Amino acid sequence: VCPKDATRFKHLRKYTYNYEAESSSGVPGTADSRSATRINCKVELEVPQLCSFILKTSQCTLKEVYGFNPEGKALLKKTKNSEEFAAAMSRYELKLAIPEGKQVFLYPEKDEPTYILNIKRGIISALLVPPETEEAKQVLFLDTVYGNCSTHFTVKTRKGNVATEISTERDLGQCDRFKPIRTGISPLALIKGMTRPLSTLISSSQSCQYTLDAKRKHVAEAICKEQHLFLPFSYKNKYGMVAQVTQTLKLEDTPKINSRFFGEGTKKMGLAFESTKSTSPPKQAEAVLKTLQELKKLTISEQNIQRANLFNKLVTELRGLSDEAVTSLLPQLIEVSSPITLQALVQCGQPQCSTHILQWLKRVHANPLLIDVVTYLVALIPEPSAQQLREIFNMARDQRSRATLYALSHAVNNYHKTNPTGTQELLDIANYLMEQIQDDCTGDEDYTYLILRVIGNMGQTMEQLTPELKSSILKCVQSTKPSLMIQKAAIQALRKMEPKDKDQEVLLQTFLDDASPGDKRLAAYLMLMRSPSQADINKIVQILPWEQNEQVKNFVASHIANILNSEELDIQDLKKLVKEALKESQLPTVMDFRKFSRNYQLYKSVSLPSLDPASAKIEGNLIFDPNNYLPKESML
Amino acid sequence: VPEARAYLRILGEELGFASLHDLQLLGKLLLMGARTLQGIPQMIGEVIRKGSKNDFFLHYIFMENAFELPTGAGLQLQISSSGVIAPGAKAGVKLEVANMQAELVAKPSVSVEFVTNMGIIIPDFARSGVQMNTNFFHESGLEAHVALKAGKLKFIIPSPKRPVKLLSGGNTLHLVSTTKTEVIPPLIENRQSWSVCKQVFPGLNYCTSGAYSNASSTDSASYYPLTGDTRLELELRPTG
């Protein structure tokens, strides 16, 4: 919706605007000695129709002061990235529409970078001119790169009912985004909550000066100047620190365009800012190395005057850098010095530094006990990161220890909940475990036992991603090669795999198998009773009177008798199936508990007021061959 | 011979397992602890025999509040400032065994510095900022050298080859570019540099000095302690 009061242009017009701006950070007390940068671009505003605009940028030259003339004139040079800079800009064109003149919805093409988008948004906010009004006091609510705004609108010069000179001004301490954007900090610095006080010590206010065409409403020129001042470091409270943003847009020409079509990039976005990283060029890392070398040199030089300073500038650059580059570089840094790298890491509140500690630990050749200790310690930290998982996988491969694998499984579950996406890490570890087990599960009994049970820790994820591993688990369960210990571990790996129709079928096959071991048969029977079916229970009850291993028969019959004894709500449903299976069979009479396996169970149901009944279920498992004076096995 | 193992599950989550083989492994771990222990004394003596330098330098940020705020152009004005401590000390004694020549270093140092920084940044692209930097340093210690030779003993104390700054009150600014960190040269007008030195010894003098620009009468410039690289220092100057 395009109100005519918002018209600041004419349709069928391309307005080519030269963008020229500079940011100059300097001290006025020393002749404004400043770090200044000069941006110059060619801009191509395109207006096939009202409020349906297309933006083509080009000829973007990025120059910055490398020196000052004696009279104070700077010396600007194009930077190394100024070419990739211009390429990045020119290689996109923007399509946008502003319903009502105060509702901005960007539609970029091919997901333009966040920072490029934000620079574009600032340019648009400079471009956006409010709808015309005859009220000089006009102040209203406006969006900007910086969020919402209470912006004042006073017409300086008006011809007829059309304003020719206008000033747009807003104090920057009132617009939505004055909240200090968080940043990584020394996680060990104890000072907190002092950020707001400083904002009081901050001064800033914006003013834009506009020259408008009364005929076609177009902006002849635009001057937007911003000045930020800081109060401390100032005698008399006026010798502080000054900053200024000065950007200008000059209308070189307004070619008329024969166009009536406007595009809308798939990605729909507003004028507001979207979070971004303190990114730095990959090169600078090498400077980090020069710096670390320098410090190592200086301790030999015996000078410590500025070492902490350089450390700070470094960790600053550090926070400018990225993750993968750091880790790739990482080994060299330790090669230089371990303890200093530690000072950096500990003072480094960035997540990657925490993740990279693991890598350090393997570098220093830590003792396995401490490796596993820290492994579990971190593994319980919420919201695991895919990277962190890759490190955990690498460490598990390297040590292949019990604690490492348990921590890996728990972190796997945590991230699985964190990210339902079956990322390539899950596939890689799944393949590695499949290698560690194969179909025969032949291997070191401790090793394969641990592999099986740790896999069970993530059973559901394995189901989701790899059915072939489940098939191999069933193979091993039905395989005679693995020891009964390994077979049982495979059975319990189904903990998180919730046996399905086929899993129940395989369990029934291996259980009703008369030659199957008594302990193995009981384990399969227990896992089958986790969620049994009436047809299954009927078959087992039919086979019960003819089962071998009298101790097995006593155990199973005692279990059934207890199930009938149980009243628990779920066991109420289970007893329906039990009854359905008891019509045409009678149980062996359950004798002996000191020399025959026996089943006992107790439930503790309490009626909590205003809450569902709480039932505590107790299972007493006794395993006795007729030759055991004491239980061969027993689980609490 | 019975084989047994046990494990603990919480919510069904196994919490590690214990094995008899695990007990045997722990036995070998104790044996390996003994094996590592046996050779330690000779190793630790070996470094004294050859000598080395020992450095113990913490660098801790007690105070730091960093953040950033956007800008109208869409760029990001970094803002942050910290107080930091680097309280370490240089050490490490080298012994020339059978030469009876002992070299000893012990000079703890204090680096009480502070920075504030503001920076307009272009992520992955560029930066522009200024760094407000107050400085306080100290060091003290001994450089000693003792040698026994042919029944002739001599304790040697190398003299300072540079001024010994007991105190160092320094303040500086810098203009920092993506590829560079540049100091801001001091004004020469009313550039007050002075020094007063008293004799602790004929070759060593206790020195008090101050170098600063007195621009208080000039507008836009903070008073004499500020607006420029200002140093108030307390030193022992070796005459050479």
Give the DSSP per-residue string, A271-317: SS---------TTHHHHHHHHHHHHHHHHHHT--TTHHHHHHHHHHH
Which one of B36, B162, B222, B231 makes the best mutation probe of the A interface by having the most chain A beta carbons within 10 Å? B222
The count of other CB atoms within 10 Å of the CB of residue B238 is 16
For residue A407, how far is the Cα from the chain centroid? 20
Please give the C-alpha separations between residue A593 and each of A71, A602, A629, B98, B133, in angstroms, as whole numbers.
Answer: 104, 16, 11, 80, 82
Residues of chain B positioned with their CB less than 8 A from the CB of A281: 124-125, 178
Cβ of B124 and A457 within 8 Å? no
Q: How far, rounded to the nearest angstrom, does the alpha carbon of residue A211 sit from its chain's CA centroid?
A: 46
> Helices H, strands E: what count in chain A?
21, 15
The reply to whether A308 touches chain B by the CB within 8 Å rule is yes
Q: Please tell me whether residue A531 adopts helix, strand or coil conformation.
A: coil
A111 — alpha (psi -120 to 50), left (phi > 0) or beta? left
Q: Which of A59, A55, A78 lies closest to A20 in space, CA to CA?
A: A59
Closest-CA distance of chain B to residue A69, Å? 15
SS3 B176: strand
Tell me the shortest Cα–Cα distance from B28 to chain A, in angstroms. 14
* Per-residue tokens: A602: 């107790």
Q: Under 8 Å CB-to-CB from B43, ≥6 apart: which residues?
A: none
Label the pairing between strands B60-70 and B230-238: unpaired
Q: Is B222 exposed, middle or buried (0-12, 13-18, 19+ CB in 10 A)?
A: buried
Q: Which residues contact A403 (CB under 8 A, 6 or more apart)?
A: A372, A373, A375, A376, B16
Residue with tokens 């690289």: B229
Q: Between chains, do A277 and B221 touch, taking CB under 8 Å as contact?
A: no
Contact A626, A598 (CB under 8 A): no
Tokens of B221: 């410039």
In angstroms, the CA B107 to CA B111 distance is 13
**Token pair in block for residue A317:** 């650059």
Q: Which of A20, A302, A519 to substitute to test the interface with B, most B CBs within 10 Å?
A: A302
How many whole angstroms from its chain centre is CA A146? 25
B33 touches A: beta carbon within 8 Å: no
Q: Counting every residue, how long is chain A?
A: 636
Residues B50 and B76: beta-carbon distance below 8 Å: no
Contact A309, B61 (CB under 8 A): no
Q: Is A183 within 8 Å of chain B by CB? A: yes
**Of B139, B159, B155, B138, nearest to B147 (Cα)?**
B155
Question: Is the distance from CB of B68 to CB of B107 less than 8 angstroms?
Answer: no
Q: Which positions in chain A touch B124 (Cβ < 8 Å)?
A: 115, 279-281
Residue A479 contacts residue B52 (beta carbons within 8 Å): no
Indicate the SS3 state at residue A200.
helix
Contact A457 B14 (CB under 8 A): yes
Question: What is the C-alpha separation between A109 and A288, in angstroms, rounded?
Answer: 36
Rounded Cα gap, residues A107 and A54, in angstroms = 10
Q: How far is CA A576 from CA A564, A601, B173, in A?
A: 9, 19, 84
Q: How far is the C-alpha of A383 from the C-alpha of A385, rounded, in Å?
A: 6
Distance of alpha carbon A169 from alpha carbon A136, whole angstroms = 12
Q: B67 near A183, Cβ under 8 Å? A: yes
Q: Say how many CA atoms lie within 13 Å of A431 toward its Cβ.
A: 4
- HSE-up (13 A, CA, CB side) for residue A75: 6
DSSP single-letter state for residue A493: G
Two tokens at A85?
A: 């800079």
Does the beta carbon of A273 lie under 8 angstroms from any beta carbon of chain B?
yes
Cβ pair A39, A72 in contact under 8 A = no
Task: Look at the alpha carbons of A463, A468, A473, A474 in this order and tell me if their dihedral is positive or negative.
Answer: positive
Chain-chain contact of A118 with B84 (C-beta, under 8 angstroms): no
- And the tokens for A348? 């480094």
How far is Cα A173 from Cα A200, in angstroms, rounded to an integer? 9
Nearest C-alpha of chain A: how many angstroms from B159?
15
Resolution in A: 9.0
The rounded distance, in Å, linking the Cα atoms of B21 and A382 is 34
Q: Is the dihedral of CA A348, A350, A354, A356 positive or negative?
A: negative
Contact B91, B53 (CB under 8 A): yes
* Window 148-177 of B, Cβ < 8 Å to A: 168, 173, 175-177
Tokens encoding B21 = 């083989």
Q: Which amino acid is at A122?
A: G
| DSSP code at position A146 | T
Q: What does the angle CA B33 – CA B38 – CA B41 come to, to the nearest 5 degrees? A: 125
Which residue in A37, A295, A353 has the most chain B C-beta atoms within 10 A of its own C-beta, making it the best mutation to test that interface?
A37
> Are B227 and A228 an interchain contact pair (Cβ–Cβ within 8 Å)?
no
SS3 assignment, position A162: strand
Contact between B227 and A30 using a beta-carbon 8 Å cutoff? yes
Residues in B touching A224 (Cβ below 8 Å): 72
Tell me, yes or no, if B122 comes closer than 8 A to chain A by beta carbon: yes
CA dist., res. B176 & res. A636, Å (int): 68
Alpha-carbon distances of A83 from A36, A203, A413, B92, rounded to whole Å = 19, 35, 46, 52
* Residue A55 near residue A45, CB atoms below 8 Å: yes
Which residue carries 């004004």 as its tokens?
B187
The span from the CA of A304 to the CA of A306, in Å, is: 6
CA distance A8 to chain B (A): 21
A 228-267 near B (Cβ less than 8 A): 228, 230, 232-235, 239-241, 243, 245, 247
Contacts of B220 (CB under 8 A, 6+ apart): A28, A29, A239
With contact defined as beta carbons under 8 Å apart, do A246 and A100 qualify? no
Look at B68 and A243 and tell me if their CB atoms are within 8 Å.
Answer: no
Question: What would the two tokens of residue A493 be?
Answer: 């790996």
Q: How remote is the C-alpha of A574 from its chain's centroid? A: 44
Residue of chain A minimizing CA distance to B17: A402
Q: Quickly tell me which residue has 């211009």 as its tokens.
A: A86
The encoded tokens of residue A423 equal 């990322």
Whether chain A has a CB inside 8 Å of the CB on B72: the answer is yes
Query: Using the beta-carbon criterion (under 8 Å), do A25 and B120 form an inter-chain contact?
Result: yes
CB count, 10 Å around CB of A481? Answer: 12
Provide the greatest CA pair distance for chain B. 97
Burial class of residue B144 in the structure, from the number of CB atoms within 10 Å of its CB (0-12 exposed, 13-18 middle, 19+ buried): middle
* Nearest by Cα to B123 from A125, A178, A63, A320: A320
Identify the experimental approach. Answer: cryo-EM
Using a 10 angstrom Cβ sphere, with 0-12 exposed, 13-18 middle and 19 or more buried, the burial of residue A465 is middle
Burial status of residue A485 (CB atoms within 10 A of its CB: 0-12, 13-18, 19 or more):
middle
Give the angle subtended at the CA of A294 by the CAs of A289 and A298, to the nearest 5°.
155
- Residue pair B225/B171 in contact (Cβ under 8 Å)? The answer is yes
| Beta carbons of A196 and B89 less than 8 angstroms apart | no
Spell out which residues of chain B touch residue A226, defining contact as CB-CB under 8 Å. Answer: 71-72
Query: What's the DSSP call for residue A256?
Result: B
**A172 vs A522: CA distance, rounded Å:** 74
| b/e per residue A368-406 (b: at least 16 CB within 10 A) | eeebbebbbebbeeeebbebbbbbbbebbeebebbbbbb
- Is any Cβ of chain A less than 8 angstroms from the Cβ of B116? yes
Q: Chain A closest CA to B147's CA: distance in Å? A: 23
| Non-local CB neighbours of B33 within 8 Å, separated by 6+ positions | none
Give the gap in angstroms from C-alpha B209 to the nearest C-alpha of chain A.
Answer: 18
Contact B61 A79 (CB under 8 A): no
N- to C-terminal Cα separation, chain B: 83
CB contact under 8 A, A181 and B70: yes
Q: What distance in Å separates the CA atoms of residue A64 and residue A74, rounded to the nearest whole number? A: 9
* B107: nearest CA partner in chain A: A302
Q: Which helix (H) or strand (E) holds B161?
A: none
Check: CB of residue A436 under 8 Å from CB of residue A473: no
Query: Do the chains contact at B128 and A25, CB–CB below 8 Å?
Result: yes
Q: Alpha-carbon distance A84 to A89, whole Å?
A: 9
* Contact predicate B99/B120, CB 8 Å: no
User: Would you tell me how many other CB atoms lie within 10 Å of the CB of residue A238?
Assistant: 12
**A193: Cβ contacts below 8 Å, ≥ 6 apart:** none
Q: Is B220 on the interface with A (CB under 8 A)?
A: yes
